[PDB]
Amino acid sequence: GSGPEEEFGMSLIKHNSCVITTENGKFTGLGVYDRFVVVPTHADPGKEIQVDGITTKVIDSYDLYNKNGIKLEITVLKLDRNEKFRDIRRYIPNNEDDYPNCNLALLANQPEPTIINVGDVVSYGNILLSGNQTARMLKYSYPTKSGYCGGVLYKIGQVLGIHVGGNGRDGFSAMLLRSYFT
Numbered sequence: 484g485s486g487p488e489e490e491f492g493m494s495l496i497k498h499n500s501c502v503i504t505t506e507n508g509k510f511t512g513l514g515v516y517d518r519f520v521v522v523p524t525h526a527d528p529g530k531e532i533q534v535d536g537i538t539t540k541v542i543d544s545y546d547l548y549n550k551n552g553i554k555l556e557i558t559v560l561k562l563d564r565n566e567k568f569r570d571i572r573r574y575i576p577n578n579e580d581d582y583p584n585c586n587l588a589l590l591a592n593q594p595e596p597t598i599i600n601v602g603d604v605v606s607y608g609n610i611l612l613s614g615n616q617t618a619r620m621l622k623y624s625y626p627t628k629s630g631y632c633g634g635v636l637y638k639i640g641q642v643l644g645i646h647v648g649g650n651g652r653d654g655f656s657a658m659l660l661r662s663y664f665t
């Protein structure tokens with residue numbers, strides 16, 4: 484920027500993100516409201532986790548699912564925090580959409596907080612090996628790494644997804660909708 488779309492991302496990292504450590508590694512977490520943090524399901528959190536290096540007891544844990552009952556691959560954790568997150572629910576869209584020129588906000592496994600321009604983002608159907616109960620993720624062409632896991636997909640005034648997967652060429656985010664949190 485620097486740059487309203489970087490300032491936005493940087494402030495989001497600063498005030499709402501954390502590094503969640505589990506037996507599976509380090510993931511970026513996003514505090515949404517109250518003491519709820521969203522983290523990739525693959526982090527596979529125990530009864531206790533580490534938040535920015537500090538052992539925290541997870542009270543409740545909720546796997547998120549779409550309209551057709553397919554797991555999003557993000558889970559919501561109720562933490563033992565101080566403390567309360569500034570409610571960012573208003574930046575989360577209500578419905579699916581495609582989004583031109585998005586960024587990715589990364590904290591975990593990075594030297595310092597990082598903003599990556601991932602380019603244009605399109606919804607893409609999950610590929611199913613059984614049935615036709617569809618699910619979408621937000622896809623982008625960018626060689627993402629497994630260390631980006633948990634990263635926040637955003638644009639100014641919009642918190643759009645959580646980075647959860649990739650194949651070397653494309654990255655994929657779990658599509659965030661406000662109704663998952665209200």
Ligand SMILES: Oc1cc(-c2ccccc2)nc2ccccc12
Pocket residue numbers: 627628629630631632646647648649650651652654655
């Ligand atoms: O963005 C990602 C990319 C890859 C990945 C997979 C195969 C080759 C190169 C990179 N693997 C990932 C694993 C977990 C979370 C995110 C990931």
